[PDB]
Amino acid sequence: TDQLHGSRVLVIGGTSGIGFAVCAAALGHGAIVTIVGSNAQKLKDSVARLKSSFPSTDPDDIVAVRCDLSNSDTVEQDIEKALQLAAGNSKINHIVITAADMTAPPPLEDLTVDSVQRPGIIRLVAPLMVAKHLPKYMNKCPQSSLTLTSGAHCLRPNPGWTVISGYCGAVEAMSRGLAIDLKPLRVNVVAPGAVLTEAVKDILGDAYDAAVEMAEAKSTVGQTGSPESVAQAYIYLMKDHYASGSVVSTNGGMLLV
Amino acid sequence: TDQLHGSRVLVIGGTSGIGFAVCAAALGHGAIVTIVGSNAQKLKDSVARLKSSFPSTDPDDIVAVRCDLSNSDTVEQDIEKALQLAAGNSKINHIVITAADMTAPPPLEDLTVDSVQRPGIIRLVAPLMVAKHLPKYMNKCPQSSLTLTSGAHCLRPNPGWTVISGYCGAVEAMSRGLAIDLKPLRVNVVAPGAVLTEAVKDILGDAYDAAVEMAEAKSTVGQTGSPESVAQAYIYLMKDHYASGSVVSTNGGMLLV
Amino acid sequence: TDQLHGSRVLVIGGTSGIGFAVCAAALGHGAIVTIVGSNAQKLKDSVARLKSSFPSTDPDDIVAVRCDLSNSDTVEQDIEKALQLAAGNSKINHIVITAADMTAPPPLEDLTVDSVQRPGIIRLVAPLMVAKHLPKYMNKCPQSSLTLTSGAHCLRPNPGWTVISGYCGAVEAMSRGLAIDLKPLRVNVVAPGAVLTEAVKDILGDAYDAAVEMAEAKSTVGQTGSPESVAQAYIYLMKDHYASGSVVSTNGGMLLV
Amino acid sequence: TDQLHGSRVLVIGGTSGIGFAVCAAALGHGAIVTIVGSNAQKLKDSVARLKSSFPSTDPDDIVAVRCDLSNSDTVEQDIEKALQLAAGNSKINHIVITAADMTAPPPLEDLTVDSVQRPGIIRLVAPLMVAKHLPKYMNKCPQSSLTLTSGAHCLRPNPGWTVISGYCGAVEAMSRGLAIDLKPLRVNVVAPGAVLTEAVKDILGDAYDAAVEMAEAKSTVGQTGSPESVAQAYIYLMKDHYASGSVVSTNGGMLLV
Numbered sequence A, B, C, D: 001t002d003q004l005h006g007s008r009v010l011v012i013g014g015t016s017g018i019g020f021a022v023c024a025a026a027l028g029h030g031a032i033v034t035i036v037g038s039n040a041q042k043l044k045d046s047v048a049r050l051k052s053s054f055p056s057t058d059p060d061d062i063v064a065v066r067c068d069l070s071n072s073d074t075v076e077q078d079i080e081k082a083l084q085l086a087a088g089n090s091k092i093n094h095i096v097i098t099a100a101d102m103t104a105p106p107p108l109e110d111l112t113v114d115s116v117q118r119p120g121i122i123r124l125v126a127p128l129m130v131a132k133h134l135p136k137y138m139n140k141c142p143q144s145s146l147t148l149t150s151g152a153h154c155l156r157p158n159p160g161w162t163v164i165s166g167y168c169g170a171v172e173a174m175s176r177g178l179a180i181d182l183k184p185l186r187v188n189v190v191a192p193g194a195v196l197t198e199a200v201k202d203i204l205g206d207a208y209d210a211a212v213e214m215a216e217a218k219s220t221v222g223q224t225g226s227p228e229s230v231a232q233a234y235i236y237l238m239k240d241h242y243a244s245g246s247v248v249s250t251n252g253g254m255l256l257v
Ligand SMILES: NC(=O)c1ccc[n+]([C@@H]2O[C@H](COP(=O)([O-])OP(=O)(O)OC[C@H]3O[C@@H](n4cnc5c(N)ncnc54)[C@H](OP(=O)(O)O)[C@@H]3O)[C@@H](O)[C@H]2O)c1
Pocket: A012, A013, A014, A015, A016, A017, A018, A019, A036, A037, A038, A039, A040, A042, A043, A067, A068, A069, A070, A071, A098, A099, A100, A101, A102, A122, A149, A150, A151, A152, A191, A192, A193, A194, A195, A196, A197, A198, A199, A200
């Protein structure tokens, strides 16, 4: 008797990192999960590793579709097709969007007009395209939810990441606009702090151990966030039929020191 | 394997409304719950309704204590007594504080020095006495949590409830200080919107019908919040081992209209 | 064309530090200023320092009265006395409240019920007593303003000042309620960061030099705040007839490092 | 003997509305002002109306440049040209950015990938291009400032304006990143509420008299905002050498009802 059992959850960005943990958490509650990513080989491994963790579950409750949401001529159709597949002959109950490139941007001296606009494709256009088309594949009711992702660097930005912190503030304001545009559907944002995903190990390279320590030190929990803890923020937003227009911040007290 | 199965949960203010729903939710995860309130027979009726809804659980896992937390002479000893009792032969894992007087304040013209300071006994002293004494009954680790209660009236005050909005802002700011003082234990706040508890009908009396309608209209969801929905925010904070220093706002989008 | 020329401004806490700079700044615009403080000796030095710096100004446009606003028997009378004096045969145009005890609080193992409530007299009751009685001495119009004082430690608390952070959080929520209670009169808050007042050397004593340069190092400006500069935040709120319900944070980027 | 005398102020977007009122305020303090807009006839009207209001002023203290910053081909080059002219034989002291198209966006039903990305050139790319090049034309010191513009719809979105609310959230978060990147130069944001500029009268058309009554009614001041009033927030940020990373919200208390 779990409230998320019959429910269909679409995770855009669920092939690795935080979004992948949300797929795992939703499956533990008995949900039907649809996963979206651009990497065909990450997509394939994601689905296999979830079936290994949940062998009881029907494989037809774990479906995956490949979309490159960074291409303007394709974002809109790939969003619509992923909404169609997540719905089946029913409607989607919850959508989660963690998808992002997370590659270090250029410094200020090399800043080009395309390096600013290119991230807005996946971070801004794709979520607005989800809102444009979700009414045909979702019921606009308070039991259904759309959740976007932001970060603590919206408020305490990292050096050289001003453009991405800008886009994190855009997602937060945007979610409030969508909570009105799509009312009574619920729209919220999760703002995570330092989460040790495999993408963050790639950006940091050989500076990974010096940045982890620092992160650890500049937090009240004295820890980095595990994807399985941050994933509970997304589950909470699916279960609280009264949460809309909010930011759920999970950052280990990082904003207090 | 649920992290809240063996866990000891102290709900200060769990005899009615939001706190009671938090006990039901915690028991649903199999937790051991200790309840605190001032009304001796609200105590035995609350406990009886949870044992009847969860006959699976041993009856010695639902315990209640009576405390008057509005009385400065006794606040500290009754807090220490409730903490000793909820810990048992073990330590406390999570504490939730929803306790509040819930009596209509005077309008500003008839403001008296006592009407300002008396609400601070249950709203400020009682949580600080918990923080003062919990290290002897709790492990200061990120797996443990203390959660206080705030409200949307901190940002959209309700005329003339300026004094109560003041204390909600104090609770939010005090929780951030406690996240520093009690680290690496986690301290957070839940800020509910309009929750139709049986207490709010007493405060409103015959103007309840009209208020409800206004509250449903000032929201994206077109409804008031159920206590069992808002209770999921408290459950989320117990399970997200990375959340500290944060505010979980569940208000139905009322801050957006 | 200066609109603070004919202006009557009451600065509660204007004998030293930030409040004193607001009196100096207001006098520079030619306003009539009334000062409130507890120290008798300090009051007559305050006015002597302003009359020498503004000798053209009629010395009767600089008045001071002594009140003990930490004092429950007298807070309301003293407030009514100061409002009556600043109004004269006219009305007060702007009120600024910087008054605070500025005494180091106890650590949390010796927290007393009185150490929680005793700061609340000057920080919460006195401004609420100003709001109660100001309608008889002010025109409730958008050209008039009430400005309270908070701090950046409301969001980044300083250990162990959790209680003082609580009251700063209360002042921020109280201002918003009073912006509604006293509409269309304007109510706002200034939240300063690190300002080297002579009181701050008293609190820290011999630890002053290790904290200053640590305050200077953990700021974007790399400097501590001058009472000159933060005083301009109060002047701004007096001149902007559209600012109400807001917090002016002047903190040198300290929430950014 | 005024702190803005002789000071060089660059106002990007100063031909109409809020920015023009900032130009007027600055000239009253004796600053040297450079005005930027795209409309050649608005620029020549700007300067003529400021010279008539300040005939004492040297005409060489009022300089104007025409730039279309909505086009990626020239935005960076034209920004550099505007910085070079505002610096002259000296360095720029303060930069203010109000520039934006202020044209109603399409409804969500017709949302196109280009309607989303196009406002980001003037709203995001141009400020980042200013930050990229201002160090050769400004001293990075706490007495100099860069101020951007946001809005109250970032927190209370206006229906159908979700995309613009996103960009205002991006500007608030980007200013914080720039307060870090440009340190110790000061970066802040002004977030205005409802200001009846001639651009707003254009969007509303025949709905102007019904929208003003709605704006005046959902405010504590019972008024729309004056451009003259809102401009004092920008002047304040130029004079407070301790303000950095902050948002000055001037909205008439609209976030409170
Ligand atoms: N890790 C942290 O500490 C942290 C902190 C704050 C905020 N965040 C934010 O949380 C979100 C996820 O972060 P993460 O650590 O979990 O990184 P991640 O593992 O790389 O997750 C990003 C997801 O987005 C997908 N994706 C990337 N590009 C795509 C594209 N063109 N089209 C479709 N899908 C695409 C990726 O799948 P494919 O690779 O298959 O395309 C991946 O599943 C990001 O917004 C991040 O900025 C992370």
